[PDB]
Amino acid sequence: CNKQNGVKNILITFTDCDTQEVIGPISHEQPDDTLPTYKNCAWTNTALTNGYVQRSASNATMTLPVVRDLRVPLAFYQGCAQVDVQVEKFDGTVMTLTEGAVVEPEESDGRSVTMNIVASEIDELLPPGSL
Amino acid sequence: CNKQNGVKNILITFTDCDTQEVIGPISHEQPDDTLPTYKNCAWTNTALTNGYVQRSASNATMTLPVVRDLRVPLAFYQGCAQVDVQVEKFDGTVMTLTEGAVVEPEESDGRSVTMNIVASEIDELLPPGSL
Amino acid sequence: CNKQNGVKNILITFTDCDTQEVIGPISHEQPDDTLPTYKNCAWTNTALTNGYVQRSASNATMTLPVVRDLRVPLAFYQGCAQVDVQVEKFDGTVMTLTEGAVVEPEESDGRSVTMNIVASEIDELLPPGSL
Amino acid sequence: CNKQNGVKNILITFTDCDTQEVIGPISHEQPDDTLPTYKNCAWTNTALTNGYVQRSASNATMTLPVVRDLRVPLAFYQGCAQVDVQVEKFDGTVMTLTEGAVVEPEESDGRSVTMNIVASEIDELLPPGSL
Amino acid sequence: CNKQNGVKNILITFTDCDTQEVIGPISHEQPDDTLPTYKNCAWTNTALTNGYVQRSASNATMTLPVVRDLRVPLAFYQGCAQVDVQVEKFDGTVMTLTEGAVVEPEESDGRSVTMNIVASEIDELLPPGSL
Amino acid sequence: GPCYNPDAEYLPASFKGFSFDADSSDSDHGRNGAEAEFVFGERTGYADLGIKIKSYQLRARFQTNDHIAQTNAFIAVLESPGPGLLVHPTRGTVFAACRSARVTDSKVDAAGVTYVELDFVEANSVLSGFG
């Protein structure tokens, strides 16, 4: 196939904060057709004048809409646990992220969560053959 | 009958402030298909730099769209009374909250209310089998 | 019946400012299906930290969309006269409000007015039997 | 033929500023079904505390969506001329306004104008029979 | 006819900045049904109190959505050249504007441009017969 | 807390007999001493010299149809000769002397309310002579 824009696998590994118990990597599934979105470059530019740029520092960002697992507390998806995320799309790309931190929690009805995770850097796998 | 996302039971227990009388736990019903939303973590992360996180302090919060009971004064749903809430979904999860405080009241036509409740912590029951 | 969410009666009593002539209580009718909305609790909460609340002071608020009577000047519905309002819904609830003050006027074409009335306290009647 | 909400007659009388020539009262027509809006009170209340009101000073205002006449320069509808307006609805009410001032002009394609007029007071005629 | 609200002719004359070469007046055409919009009055009012007005100074403004000519550089439509515009509607009105200045450029895909032009004064022609 | 009754926990403020409603309550406690910084030395000294004189700052509001008379009476009381007894809303009874009282009172911006910013100082009695 290798011609389908879509997410295939989502692995999340939870680390409890006050017991350091590792949980996972549990698979996960999407609540709707919206895909997780990424941003890898740490430095972010900003226009200055005739052609130049002013460079700022930032984090490697990820937005992950996921369906809560009924075996894991809801608070683990809202900033009360460390997360390691790994998303594999249908065309072969694999984005891994470790020592994340859910940065902006928001009210969730109990099924669908939207995690905003910031890390030092995101790794990309790029299907075989690449420049 | 699992694999149904939806709220099954809502118990709300009112406590007047000027007389310390307890009312309930009365059952309740939703005005529409929107489900209550939760947040159990206490501290909210915030992105800082390349990989690090700045940790702030916050609340356990709950958002409860409910249908006003006709035997209970409307003001009880609008911050003039302490609330103790208990929501049970169809997958078995039970979220209980005690010593609530309706934190941002709003205009209601007299039938449907949306209670924003804040508390120290919300407890999760996590259907049998858990990690 | 007693199973129909809707407004049945709207009585408004106008008091001229510079002559203290009482007018009413004239009945009134809705321009569309939107109902008047209420808020009784005087103190309004605000979240502080782990579980606590900071309490502010406010007014008993009412929002009343109504159809202007052709016998009463338009300025009476826009803050140039004192109002006493009384709304009775179909399920038996009756909200009375006296010594109101139309607080935020807005342009109206001449038929439909939306009065935002603030008072010290709103009284609620709660169909027979109540806790 | 009463019980029709709609505007029947619009007379606008222009007065140039640099020559003090009076033009009109020309009739006019609406560009669409939106009706002009009014506000006759002078002071605008504002909620203060449990029941009280803080009274501010303001204008008698009118909002007039009208179709530009081709014999009158466009600038006359955009603040470069004094206006005296008279609107008669189908229920018999007549709102007259004199010594207007188009207070916030806006881009117009050349046919439809929306005049925001401010004046000391707007007079209401209140179809026969009144209280 | 003389009963059709629409634009008939759009003439634009470009003046290069660093060579003062005059180009035009080239005709032009609309990208969609939105018409150019105008504002002639230089002084703009602002409401003050019971009936009075505070008068500010401004420019004669024009908004011109047009289709880029393939013979003229795109930068000429984005503030890098002086413009003289002349728009003639179907009912006979003619708005001429000279020594304009495209004041707020914005990204354009290469076909449709929206020029925001400010000048000292706009002239209006008013089909024969006028008051 | 969730059932914190404010006006059943804050004392109603009053100075020298005259009662009023306060909007804020501050204090300026402290402990004054010297600070020794011996030259060329990695050591520092401190000497406790006494008690820093206490000062209170309040903000009174007047929102009533006769706020002008109330503010005039309060001015006449505050200018009485000699220190008098003050009921600080959160510190109870003290003996203070008024030191400044700004009276903000606008008309075309907020008519109806009058604010007074008060500044008192702990004024303890003495015993004439050389004590």
mmCIF file of N, CA, C and O in Angstrom, chain F residues 2-83:
data_model
loop_
_atom_site.group_PDB
_atom_site.id
_atom_site.type_symbol
_atom_site.label_atom_id
_atom_site.label_comp_id
_atom_site.label_asym_id
_atom_site.label_seq_id
_atom_site.Cartn_x
_atom_site.Cartn_y
_atom_site.Cartn_z
ATOM 1 N N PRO F 2 -15.977 26.431 51.048
ATOM 2 C CA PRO F 2 -17.161 26.429 50.182
ATOM 3 C C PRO F 2 -18.378 27.088 50.805
ATOM 4 O O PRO F 2 -19.253 27.574 50.085
ATOM 5 N N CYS F 3 -18.452 27.106 52.132
ATOM 6 C CA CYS F 3 -19.554 27.719 52.867
ATOM 7 C C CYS F 3 -19.048 28.832 53.773
ATOM 8 O O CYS F 3 -19.447 28.951 54.930
ATOM 9 N N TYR F 4 -18.139 29.645 53.251
ATOM 10 C CA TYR F 4 -17.572 30.773 53.980
ATOM 11 C C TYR F 4 -18.526 31.948 53.847
ATOM 12 O O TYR F 4 -18.684 32.508 52.764
ATOM 13 N N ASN F 5 -19.201 32.300 54.927
ATOM 14 C CA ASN F 5 -20.007 33.514 54.922
ATOM 15 C C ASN F 5 -19.138 34.726 55.212
ATOM 16 O O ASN F 5 -18.700 34.890 56.356
ATOM 17 N N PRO F 6 -18.871 35.592 54.243
ATOM 18 C CA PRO F 6 -17.979 36.725 54.499
ATOM 19 C C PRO F 6 -18.507 37.687 55.545
ATOM 20 O O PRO F 6 -17.836 37.920 56.552
ATOM 21 N N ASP F 7 -19.704 38.236 55.343
ATOM 22 C CA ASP F 7 -20.195 39.244 56.275
ATOM 23 C C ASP F 7 -20.489 38.683 57.659
ATOM 24 O O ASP F 7 -20.757 39.462 58.577
ATOM 25 N N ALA F 8 -20.439 37.369 57.838
ATOM 26 C CA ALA F 8 -20.467 36.770 59.163
ATOM 27 C C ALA F 8 -19.073 36.469 59.683
ATOM 28 O O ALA F 8 -18.938 35.825 60.725
ATOM 29 N N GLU F 9 -18.037 36.919 58.978
ATOM 30 C CA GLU F 9 -16.655 36.722 59.394
ATOM 31 C C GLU F 9 -15.827 37.993 59.393
ATOM 32 O O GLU F 9 -14.819 38.041 60.102
ATOM 33 N N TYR F 10 -16.204 39.008 58.628
ATOM 34 C CA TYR F 10 -15.534 40.297 58.639
ATOM 35 C C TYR F 10 -16.323 41.258 59.512
ATOM 36 O O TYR F 10 -17.554 41.280 59.465
ATOM 37 N N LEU F 11 -15.621 42.044 60.301
ATOM 38 C CA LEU F 11 -16.317 42.978 61.174
ATOM 39 C C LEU F 11 -16.746 44.218 60.397
ATOM 40 O O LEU F 11 -15.997 44.713 59.555
ATOM 41 N N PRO F 12 -17.943 44.735 60.655
ATOM 42 C CA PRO F 12 -18.372 45.958 59.975
ATOM 43 C C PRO F 12 -17.541 47.136 60.450
ATOM 44 O O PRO F 12 -17.482 47.426 61.645
ATOM 45 N N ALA F 13 -16.907 47.815 59.505
ATOM 46 C CA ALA F 13 -15.967 48.865 59.842
ATOM 47 C C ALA F 13 -16.697 50.111 60.309
ATOM 48 O O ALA F 13 -17.840 50.365 59.936
ATOM 49 N N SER F 14 -16.013 50.889 61.141
ATOM 50 C CA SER F 14 -16.544 52.123 61.696
ATOM 51 C C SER F 14 -15.399 52.880 62.332
ATOM 52 O O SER F 14 -14.498 52.268 62.901
ATOM 53 N N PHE F 15 -15.435 54.201 62.240
ATOM 54 C CA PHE F 15 -14.423 55.034 62.868
ATOM 55 C C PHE F 15 -15.100 56.064 63.748
ATOM 56 O O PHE F 15 -15.987 56.786 63.290
ATOM 57 N N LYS F 16 -14.685 56.120 65.010
ATOM 58 C CA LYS F 16 -15.088 57.185 65.918
ATOM 59 C C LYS F 16 -16.605 57.214 66.089
ATOM 60 O O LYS F 16 -17.197 58.263 66.333
ATOM 61 N N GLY F 17 -17.243 56.057 65.946
ATOM 62 C CA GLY F 17 -18.678 55.935 66.116
ATOM 63 C C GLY F 17 -19.433 55.781 64.814
ATOM 64 O O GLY F 17 -20.334 54.946 64.703
ATOM 65 N N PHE F 18 -19.062 56.581 63.821
ATOM 66 C CA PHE F 18 -19.692 56.532 62.509
ATOM 67 C C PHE F 18 -19.372 55.212 61.828
ATOM 68 O O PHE F 18 -18.207 54.827 61.727
ATOM 69 N N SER F 19 -20.401 54.512 61.367
ATOM 70 C CA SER F 19 -20.231 53.231 60.702
ATOM 71 C C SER F 19 -20.287 53.403 59.191
ATOM 72 O O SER F 19 -20.982 54.278 58.674
ATOM 73 N N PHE F 20 -19.556 52.547 58.488
ATOM 74 C CA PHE F 20 -19.517 52.573 57.034
ATOM 75 C C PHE F 20 -19.125 51.187 56.551
ATOM 76 O O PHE F 20 -18.813 50.298 57.343
ATOM 77 N N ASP F 21 -19.171 51.004 55.238
ATOM 78 C CA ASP F 21 -18.835 49.730 54.620
ATOM 79 C C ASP F 21 -17.497 49.850 53.916
ATOM 80 O O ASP F 21 -17.315 50.725 53.068
ATOM 81 N N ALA F 22 -16.572 48.963 54.255
ATOM 82 C CA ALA F 22 -15.215 49.029 53.748
ATOM 83 C C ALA F 22 -15.026 48.042 52.605
ATOM 84 O O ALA F 22 -15.700 47.016 52.513
ATOM 85 N N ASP F 23 -14.080 48.370 51.739
ATOM 86 C CA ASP F 23 -13.794 47.594 50.550
ATOM 87 C C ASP F 23 -12.421 46.941 50.587
ATOM 88 O O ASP F 23 -12.175 46.010 49.814
ATOM 89 N N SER F 24 -11.532 47.380 51.468
ATOM 90 C CA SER F 24 -10.211 46.795 51.590
ATOM 91 C C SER F 24 -9.750 46.969 53.024
ATOM 92 O O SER F 24 -10.357 47.699 53.807
ATOM 93 N N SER F 25 -8.667 46.285 53.371
ATOM 94 C CA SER F 25 -8.162 46.319 54.739
ATOM 95 C C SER F 25 -6.703 45.911 54.714
ATOM 96 O O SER F 25 -6.393 44.779 54.339
ATOM 97 N N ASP F 26 -5.810 46.810 55.107
ATOM 98 C CA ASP F 26 -4.383 46.533 55.065
ATOM 99 C C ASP F 26 -3.767 46.790 56.433
ATOM 100 O O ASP F 26 -4.431 47.251 57.361
ATOM 101 N N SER F 27 -2.481 46.473 56.554
ATOM 102 C CA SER F 27 -1.716 46.746 57.760
ATOM 103 C C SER F 27 -0.244 46.811 57.387
ATOM 104 O O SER F 27 0.165 46.316 56.336
ATOM 105 N N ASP F 28 0.541 47.438 58.256
ATOM 106 C CA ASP F 28 1.945 47.730 57.988
ATOM 107 C C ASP F 28 2.802 47.416 59.206
ATOM 108 O O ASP F 28 3.566 48.251 59.687
ATOM 109 N N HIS F 29 2.654 46.214 59.748
ATOM 110 C CA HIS F 29 3.435 45.798 60.900
ATOM 111 C C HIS F 29 4.924 45.748 60.565
ATOM 112 O O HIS F 29 5.338 45.883 59.414
ATOM 113 N N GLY F 30 5.737 45.543 61.588
ATOM 114 C CA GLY F 30 7.167 45.470 61.383
ATOM 115 C C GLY F 30 7.939 45.598 62.676
ATOM 116 O O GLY F 30 7.383 45.766 63.756
ATOM 117 N N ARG F 31 9.254 45.508 62.526
ATOM 118 C CA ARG F 31 10.202 45.441 63.627
ATOM 119 C C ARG F 31 11.487 46.118 63.180
ATOM 120 O O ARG F 31 12.221 45.550 62.371
ATOM 121 N N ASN F 32 11.774 47.310 63.695
ATOM 122 C CA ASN F 32 12.886 48.093 63.162
ATOM 123 C C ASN F 32 14.162 47.932 63.976
ATOM 124 O O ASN F 32 14.132 47.895 65.206
ATOM 125 N N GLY F 33 15.287 47.851 63.268
ATOM 126 C CA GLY F 33 16.593 47.688 63.877
ATOM 127 C C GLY F 33 17.683 48.201 62.963
ATOM 128 O O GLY F 33 17.432 48.622 61.833
ATOM 129 N N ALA F 34 18.908 48.173 63.481
ATOM 130 C CA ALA F 34 20.083 48.595 62.735
ATOM 131 C C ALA F 34 20.649 47.432 61.925
ATOM 132 O O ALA F 34 20.155 46.306 61.981
ATOM 133 N N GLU F 35 21.713 47.697 61.168
ATOM 134 C CA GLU F 35 22.307 46.680 60.300
ATOM 135 C C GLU F 35 23.794 46.982 60.191
ATOM 136 O O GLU F 35 24.174 47.972 59.562
ATOM 137 N N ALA F 36 24.632 46.146 60.794
ATOM 138 C CA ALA F 36 26.060 46.419 60.871
ATOM 139 C C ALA F 36 26.820 45.681 59.782
ATOM 140 O O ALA F 36 26.626 44.481 59.577
ATOM 141 N N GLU F 37 27.717 46.402 59.116
ATOM 142 C CA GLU F 37 28.431 45.930 57.933
ATOM 143 C C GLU F 37 29.915 46.262 58.033
ATOM 144 O O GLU F 37 30.482 46.924 57.165
ATOM 145 N N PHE F 38 30.538 45.853 59.137
ATOM 146 C CA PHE F 38 31.955 46.080 59.409
ATOM 147 C C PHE F 38 32.811 45.943 58.157
ATOM 148 O O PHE F 38 32.649 45.001 57.380
ATOM 149 N N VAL F 39 33.735 46.887 57.974
ATOM 150 C CA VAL F 39 34.525 46.942 56.750
ATOM 151 C C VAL F 39 35.466 45.751 56.674
ATOM 152 O O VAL F 39 35.917 45.218 57.692
ATOM 153 N N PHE F 40 35.759 45.326 55.446
ATOM 154 C CA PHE F 40 36.709 44.250 55.167
ATOM 155 C C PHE F 40 36.353 42.958 55.891
ATOM 156 O O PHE F 40 37.220 42.118 56.132
ATOM 157 N N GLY F 41 35.092 42.763 56.224
ATOM 158 C CA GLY F 41 34.700 41.661 57.086
ATOM 159 C C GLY F 41 33.635 40.782 56.474
ATOM 160 O O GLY F 41 32.712 41.268 55.828
ATOM 161 N N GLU F 42 33.783 39.477 56.682
ATOM 162 C CA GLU F 42 32.755 38.504 56.327
ATOM 163 C C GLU F 42 31.915 38.183 57.559
ATOM 164 O O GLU F 42 31.934 37.084 58.108
ATOM 165 N N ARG F 43 31.162 39.190 57.984
ATOM 166 C CA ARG F 43 30.307 39.100 59.155
ATOM 167 C C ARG F 43 29.389 40.310 59.147
ATOM 168 O O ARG F 43 29.702 41.344 58.553
ATOM 169 N N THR F 44 28.255 40.169 59.815
ATOM 170 C CA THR F 44 27.245 41.208 59.796
ATOM 171 C C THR F 44 26.533 41.196 61.136
ATOM 172 O O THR F 44 26.388 40.148 61.767
ATOM 173 N N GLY F 45 26.098 42.376 61.581
ATOM 174 C CA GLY F 45 25.430 42.512 62.851
ATOM 175 C C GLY F 45 24.015 43.037 62.677
ATOM 176 O O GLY F 45 23.640 43.554 61.625
ATOM 177 N N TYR F 46 23.249 42.937 63.756
ATOM 178 C CA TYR F 46 21.884 43.430 63.774
ATOM 179 C C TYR F 46 21.528 43.750 65.212
ATOM 180 O O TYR F 46 21.927 43.036 66.134
ATOM 181 N N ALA F 47 20.771 44.828 65.393
ATOM 182 C CA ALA F 47 20.372 45.295 66.715
ATOM 183 C C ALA F 47 18.912 45.703 66.649
ATOM 184 O O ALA F 47 18.559 46.610 65.895
ATOM 185 N N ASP F 48 18.071 45.030 67.426
ATOM 186 C CA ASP F 48 16.643 45.323 67.488
ATOM 187 C C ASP F 48 16.403 46.602 68.276
ATOM 188 O O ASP F 48 16.776 46.689 69.449
ATOM 189 N N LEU F 49 15.772 47.594 67.652
ATOM 190 C CA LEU F 49 15.606 48.897 68.280
ATOM 191 C C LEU F 49 14.196 49.177 68.774
ATOM 192 O O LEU F 49 14.010 50.137 69.524
ATOM 193 N N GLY F 50 13.203 48.397 68.375
ATOM 194 C CA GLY F 50 11.878 48.635 68.904
ATOM 195 C C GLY F 50 10.742 48.114 68.055
ATOM 196 O O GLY F 50 10.853 47.054 67.445
ATOM 197 N N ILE F 51 9.637 48.850 68.028
ATOM 198 C CA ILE F 51 8.420 48.459 67.331
ATOM 199 C C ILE F 51 8.138 49.486 66.251
ATOM 200 O O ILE F 51 8.182 50.693 66.514
ATOM 201 N N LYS F 52 7.859 49.012 65.044
ATOM 202 C CA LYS F 52 7.490 49.899 63.955
ATOM 203 C C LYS F 52 6.022 50.272 64.091
ATOM 204 O O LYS F 52 5.172 49.403 64.295
ATOM 205 N N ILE F 53 5.728 51.568 63.993
ATOM 206 C CA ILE F 53 4.374 52.044 64.242
ATOM 207 C C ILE F 53 3.420 51.485 63.193
ATOM 208 O O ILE F 53 3.714 51.474 61.993
ATOM 209 N N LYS F 54 2.275 50.990 63.654
ATOM 210 C CA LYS F 54 1.305 50.351 62.779
ATOM 211 C C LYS F 54 0.486 51.385 62.031
ATOM 212 O O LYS F 54 0.213 52.474 62.536
ATOM 213 N N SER F 55 0.082 51.030 60.819
ATOM 214 C CA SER F 55 -0.752 51.896 60.007
ATOM 215 C C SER F 55 -1.726 51.040 59.220
ATOM 216 O O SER F 55 -1.377 49.954 58.757
ATOM 217 N N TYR F 56 -2.946 51.539 59.074
ATOM 218 C CA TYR F 56 -4.021 50.834 58.399
ATOM 219 C C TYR F 56 -4.486 51.656 57.208
ATOM 220 O O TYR F 56 -4.465 52.885 57.245
ATOM 221 N N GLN F 57 -4.894 50.978 56.144
ATOM 222 C CA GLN F 57 -5.381 51.643 54.943
ATOM 223 C C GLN F 57 -6.670 50.975 54.506
ATOM 224 O O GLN F 57 -6.722 49.750 54.387
ATOM 225 N N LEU F 58 -7.705 51.770 54.276
ATOM 226 C CA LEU F 58 -9.002 51.228 53.897
ATOM 227 C C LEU F 58 -9.538 51.942 52.666
ATOM 228 O O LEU F 58 -9.037 52.987 52.253
ATOM 229 N N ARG F 59 -10.591 51.367 52.098
ATOM 230 C CA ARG F 59 -11.309 51.976 50.987
ATOM 231 C C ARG F 59 -12.796 51.822 51.256
ATOM 232 O O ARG F 59 -13.315 50.707 51.239
ATOM 233 N N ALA F 60 -13.473 52.928 51.520
ATOM 234 C CA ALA F 60 -14.899 52.919 51.784
ATOM 235 C C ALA F 60 -15.672 53.264 50.522
ATOM 236 O O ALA F 60 -15.221 54.053 49.690
ATOM 237 N N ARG F 61 -16.847 52.667 50.389
ATOM 238 C CA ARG F 61 -17.716 52.891 49.248
ATOM 239 C C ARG F 61 -19.034 53.475 49.716
ATOM 240 O O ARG F 61 -19.486 53.208 50.831
ATOM 241 N N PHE F 62 -19.662 54.259 48.849
ATOM 242 C CA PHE F 62 -20.992 54.784 49.119
ATOM 243 C C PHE F 62 -21.789 54.672 47.831
ATOM 244 O O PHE F 62 -21.509 55.388 46.866
ATOM 245 N N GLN F 63 -22.753 53.751 47.808
ATOM 246 C CA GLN F 63 -23.590 53.482 46.640
ATOM 247 C C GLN F 63 -25.032 53.527 47.115
ATOM 248 O O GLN F 63 -25.643 52.497 47.387
ATOM 249 N N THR F 64 -25.593 54.725 47.188
ATOM 250 C CA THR F 64 -26.933 54.894 47.720
ATOM 251 C C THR F 64 -27.480 56.192 47.153
ATOM 252 O O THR F 64 -26.721 57.082 46.771
ATOM 253 N N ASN F 65 -28.806 56.294 47.093
ATOM 254 C CA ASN F 65 -29.428 57.500 46.560
ATOM 255 C C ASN F 65 -28.993 58.754 47.304
ATOM 256 O O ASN F 65 -29.081 59.853 46.749
ATOM 257 N N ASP F 66 -28.529 58.617 48.540
ATOM 258 C CA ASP F 66 -28.039 59.759 49.297
ATOM 259 C C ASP F 66 -26.587 59.549 49.690
ATOM 260 O O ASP F 66 -26.220 59.721 50.852
ATOM 261 N N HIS F 67 -25.757 59.144 48.733
ATOM 262 C CA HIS F 67 -24.342 58.985 49.016
ATOM 263 C C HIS F 67 -23.639 60.313 49.234
ATOM 264 O O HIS F 67 -22.611 60.346 49.915
ATOM 265 N N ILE F 68 -24.164 61.410 48.686
ATOM 266 C CA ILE F 68 -23.512 62.701 48.874
ATOM 267 C C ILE F 68 -23.613 63.140 50.327
ATOM 268 O O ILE F 68 -22.634 63.610 50.916
ATOM 269 N N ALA F 69 -24.792 62.997 50.926
ATOM 270 C CA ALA F 69 -24.948 63.357 52.329
ATOM 271 C C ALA F 69 -24.125 62.450 53.228
ATOM 272 O O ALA F 69 -23.543 62.910 54.215
ATOM 273 N N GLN F 70 -24.060 61.159 52.905
ATOM 274 C CA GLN F 70 -23.257 60.244 53.708
ATOM 275 C C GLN F 70 -21.781 60.595 53.628
ATOM 276 O O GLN F 70 -21.078 60.582 54.641
ATOM 277 N N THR F 71 -21.292 60.921 52.432
ATOM 278 C CA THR F 71 -19.892 61.296 52.298
ATOM 279 C C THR F 71 -19.599 62.610 53.005
ATOM 280 O O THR F 71 -18.536 62.765 53.607
ATOM 281 N N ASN F 72 -20.525 63.570 52.956
ATOM 282 C CA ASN F 72 -20.314 64.810 53.693
ATOM 283 C C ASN F 72 -20.274 64.563 55.195
ATOM 284 O O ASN F 72 -19.432 65.133 55.900
ATOM 285 N N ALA F 73 -21.167 63.716 55.707
ATOM 286 C CA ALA F 73 -21.144 63.408 57.132
ATOM 287 C C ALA F 73 -19.858 62.693 57.517
ATOM 288 O O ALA F 73 -19.273 62.965 58.572
ATOM 289 N N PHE F 74 -19.391 61.786 56.664
ATOM 290 C CA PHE F 74 -18.167 61.061 56.963
ATOM 291 C C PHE F 74 -16.960 61.983 56.934
ATOM 292 O O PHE F 74 -16.054 61.836 57.756
ATOM 293 N N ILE F 75 -16.942 62.948 56.015
ATOM 294 C CA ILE F 75 -15.878 63.948 56.001
ATOM 295 C C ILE F 75 -15.903 64.760 57.284
ATOM 296 O O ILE F 75 -14.864 65.013 57.901
ATOM 297 N N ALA F 76 -17.092 65.191 57.701
ATOM 298 C CA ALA F 76 -17.186 65.974 58.924
ATOM 299 C C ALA F 76 -16.728 65.177 60.134
ATOM 300 O O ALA F 76 -16.203 65.753 61.090
ATOM 301 N N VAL F 77 -16.917 63.860 60.119
ATOM 302 C CA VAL F 77 -16.458 63.053 61.247
ATOM 303 C C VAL F 77 -14.950 62.859 61.202
ATOM 304 O O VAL F 77 -14.276 62.953 62.230
ATOM 305 N N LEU F 78 -14.396 62.591 60.018
ATOM 306 C CA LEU F 78 -12.969 62.297 59.913
ATOM 307 C C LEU F 78 -12.110 63.485 60.313
ATOM 308 O O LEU F 78 -10.981 63.303 60.775
ATOM 309 N N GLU F 79 -12.610 64.699 60.122
ATOM 310 C CA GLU F 79 -11.900 65.915 60.482
ATOM 311 C C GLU F 79 -12.144 66.331 61.924
ATOM 312 O O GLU F 79 -11.928 67.496 62.265
ATOM 313 N N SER F 80 -12.606 65.428 62.762
ATOM 314 C CA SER F 80 -12.777 65.770 64.162
ATOM 315 C C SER F 80 -11.418 65.810 64.854
ATOM 316 O O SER F 80 -10.527 65.038 64.505
ATOM 317 N N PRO F 81 -11.232 66.700 65.826
ATOM 318 C CA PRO F 81 -9.926 66.813 66.483
ATOM 319 C C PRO F 81 -9.650 65.615 67.378
ATOM 320 O O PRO F 81 -10.510 65.190 68.150
ATOM 321 N N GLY F 82 -8.440 65.073 67.269
ATOM 322 C CA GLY F 82 -7.994 64.023 68.153
ATOM 323 C C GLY F 82 -8.245 62.627 67.626
ATOM 324 O O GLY F 82 -9.179 62.388 66.856
ATOM 325 N N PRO F 83 -7.413 61.674 68.034
ATOM 326 C CA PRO F 83 -7.598 60.293 67.589
ATOM 327 C C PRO F 83 -8.813 59.656 68.238
ATOM 328 O O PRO F 83 -9.267 60.060 69.309
#
